[PDB]
Design a protein around this ligand. Sequence first.
Ligand SMILES: [Zn+2]
Length: 257
Amino acid sequence: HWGYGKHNGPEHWHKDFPIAKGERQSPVDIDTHTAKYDPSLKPLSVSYDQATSLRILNNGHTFNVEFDDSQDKAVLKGGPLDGTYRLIQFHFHWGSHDGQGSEHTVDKKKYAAELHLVHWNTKYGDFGKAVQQPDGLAVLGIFLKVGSANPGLQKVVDVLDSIKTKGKSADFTNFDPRGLLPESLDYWTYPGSLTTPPLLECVTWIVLKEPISVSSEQVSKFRKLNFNGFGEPEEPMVDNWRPTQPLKNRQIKASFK
Ligand SMILES: [Zn+2]
């Protein structure tokens, strides 16, 4: 079983998942001195007014908030994307301390956490079909910068004590994902991958320029989750981030000057 420990962590994933050394792996470092403004890039259209959250789950690697994805209600369009992508889940990556935790970096800067809002391309019918395609997913990556407490996160923080160990889940209705968005939707974009095994190269990454805030106390609550399940030794869920991978032949485009 892959994980984030010394023995089963990112450095070793290529043994069981050889695509880990592929041509379009994520995350990447975003060099603002080389990412090119593309004035043709469209504004992002985020339509979450009618999103329906359902549950929250500790999967042993992160926690996921799952949404109903039966209809074109909660959707991402525009930006670099063709067509409509439905929100299916979001999750976070975070550190053992406030100085690290993000997967993407900006000029090598690491944030305390990173939010991934995962969407799939409706041209492919469902998530499982979409992940087999290079344009199957669109993921909105949002940095969390330590500062003031974020009221948009509080409902998540307040439920985490009910999903402490792997396999636990809880009902989680009426969560508004709009509260996790920054004011500006300026972004960088590039083609990449899932950041966990199976590391499939099926993602259009859309990384927002503006972080959202998080208080130190809020991100300390993430660290009270555990990677392990029942009967396994206790292992705090911290440093569940993959480090940046080679950009190779790819171009990171900026939507903003
Ligand atoms: Zn992720």
